[PDB]
Amino acid sequence: FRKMAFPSGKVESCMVQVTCGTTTLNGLWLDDVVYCPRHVICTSEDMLNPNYEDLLIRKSNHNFLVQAGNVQLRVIGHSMQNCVLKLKVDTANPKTPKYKFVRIQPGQTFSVLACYNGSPSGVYQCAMRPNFTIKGSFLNGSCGSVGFNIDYDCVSFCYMHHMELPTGVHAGTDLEGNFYGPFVDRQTAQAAGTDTTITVNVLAWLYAAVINGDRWFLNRFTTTLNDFNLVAMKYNYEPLTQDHVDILGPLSAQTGIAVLDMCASLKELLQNGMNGRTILGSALLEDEFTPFDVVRQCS
Amino acid sequence: FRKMAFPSGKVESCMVQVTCGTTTLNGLWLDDVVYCPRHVICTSEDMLNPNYEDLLIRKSNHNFLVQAGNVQLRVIGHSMQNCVLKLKVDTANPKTPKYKFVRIQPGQTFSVLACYNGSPSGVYQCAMRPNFTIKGSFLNGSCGSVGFNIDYDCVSFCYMHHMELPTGVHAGTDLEGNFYGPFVDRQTAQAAGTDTTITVNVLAWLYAAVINGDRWFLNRFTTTLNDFNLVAMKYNYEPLTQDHVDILGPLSAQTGIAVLDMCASLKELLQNGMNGRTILGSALLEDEFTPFDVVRQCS
Numbered sequence A, B: 001f002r003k004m005a006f007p008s009g010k011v012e013s014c015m016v017q018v019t020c021g022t023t024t025l026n027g028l029w030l031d032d033v034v035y036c037p038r039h040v041i042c043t044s045e046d047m048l049n050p051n052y053e054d055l056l057i058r059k060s061n062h063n064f065l066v067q068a069g070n071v072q073l074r075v076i077g078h079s080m081q082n083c084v085l086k087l088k089v090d091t092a093n094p095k096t097p098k099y100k101f102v103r104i105q106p107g108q109t110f111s112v113l114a115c116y117n118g119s120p121s122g123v124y125q126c127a128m129r130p131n132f133t134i135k136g137s138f139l140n141g142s143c144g145s146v147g148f149n150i151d152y153d154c155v156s157f158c159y160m161h162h163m164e165l166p167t168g169v170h171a172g173t174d175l176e177g178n179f180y181g182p183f184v185d186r187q188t189a190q191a192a193g194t195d196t197t198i199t200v201n202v203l204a205w206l207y208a209a210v211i212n213g214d215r216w217f218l219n220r221f222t223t224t225l226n227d228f229n230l231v232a233m234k235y236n237y238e239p240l241t242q243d244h245v246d247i248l249g250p251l252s253a254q255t256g257i258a259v260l261d262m263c264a265s266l267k268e269l270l271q272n273g274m275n276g277r278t279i280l281g282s283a284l285l286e287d288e289f290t291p292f293d294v295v296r297q298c299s
């Protein structure tokens, strides 16, 4: 099984560039609103400790250069919502898809359309880590790139990119401008908390292995959810939620392997290792495939 | 550093559904021609051992149902070029990109847009293996999905999907209908030649590991090109040519690590193994990033 992004075309048609002075980044053009990171209004020097309310007071509509390719879209209104700017423009995007703004949970995956100067450059799958970072691939000028899922031609936007942490991982907001995690948009030294392994996704990957015939690791034991959660944390695995149990439902039904039975199989893998054996050809337990990713890739 | 695909929107606008009898697959709609695998004209019994020229002479234009979204396109002509069928339609694709048909070489990479019933489903990066298979994610109905590279508005189509081998790897043609590898479009179990590892790509990926702050595998040894190639061939790695050494030039200059110094690193890696350590989070030596892939992503 492979990491597979959603086709990016519906989002590509919504990418624009936003320039303030000499600072350019990307924006998301939906209907007659362009969404973008608010630090576009910062000069290099203002990014250490910016006062965004004060910086925005000095800006008018005419200070914002919004372009779709080289075609200017005139800004007729602006406001700030948390860490994002909303620039109302005079043209409704004719390629606006059916869309939603959603806030995802750690463990959930999404496709990222990496953009520079409003031009799409690449697409790849990311998982939100439990420490609310993503392991992305972003360069200078990538801010305003978005992450999304597509469900039946409806695009659910979940991520907008703002910053890189000193460990090389990345941090950003939802499309209402609220950061994932304890991060802020200031060019200050920030540290991601210690990360953990996404337990629900490892279990999804064990089900994927079982579906394909690799089931040596199935054992004869079961566990309670609470006992599993307490042992999992000793191995720096995330605890399972009730929602996690429910989204494993379809895979449990397909294989006939109860969710808590698979938890006991995983627990034995953590307490004893894999004893030189592999699962789906890998000696490592993969944790960036969700139960939906497994179902979507097998269907 | 992630496996990154090209944005797929320009190709999405070209995918259509092609039905003949009870067989359905995807087609690529460029200008007024639809390109699709020729086995669409085959029934179940036909597939087992088809005589394609004999099967195609007995087909009429109206035997082909081409659908672009909900709208049927009328077939007004049809010819066969090797394993690809060219259906002339009465409507030109209004969103035909600037495009070229190219045949790639083993070791080169491309993006795959996986499609079902003419609708795009996922996008991911593949490399043409030295044995001319690709390790894809394809299911029933995915034939006619295409692989491509994008260079400044120009889409270079290099692959069209036709089948899955018993080992689970995949085989297909260029857009002139010629298979990559010794394969045929017949429903029969076929084996590929013994595969080898793409050495120039492993070296590019090791440079990506260093660009991203990982150096544990480096050493103070050096090696000649020929002495490296002796060990490489012993481990079923493809030979490294002087052209490969040149293509790695920019990556060596960026890191200050001479290519033959990185070859000594890989030689030690091959002879000792990874000792259960990881490089860019991988327990295996990755060979599906070309030097260009690394440069584009890392700069």
Ligand SMILES: *[C@H](O)[C@H](C[C@@H]1CCNC1=O)NC(=O)[C@H](CC(C)C)NC(=O)OCc1ccccc1
Pocket: A025, A039, A047, A138, A139, A140, A141, A142, A143, A144, A162, A163, A164, A165, A166, A170, A184, A185, A186, A187, A188, A189, A190
């Ligand atoms: C937006 O394009 C840019 C994306 C960064 C740049 C390179 N790779 C990325 O992910 N975002 C920033 O440059 C961001 C702006 C702040 C106002 C949020 N600052 C940043 O990422 O630097 C982080 C940093 C923290 C502490 C010391 C030095 C740098």
Ligand SMILES: *[C@H](O)[C@H](C[C@@H]1CCNC1=O)NC(=O)[C@H](CC(C)C)NC(=O)OCc1ccccc1
Pocket: B025, B039, B047, B138, B139, B140, B141, B142, B143, B144, B162, B163, B164, B165, B166, B170, B184, B185, B186, B187, B188, B189, B190
């Ligand atoms: C086209 O949609 C389909 C794609 C395959 C189906 C499952 N995963 C894929 O990638 N191609 C075929 O079904 C292909 C048609 C032949 C006429 C070329 N046949 C095939 O892939 O099976 C080959 C095979 C034959 C005998 C034993 C085992 C495999």
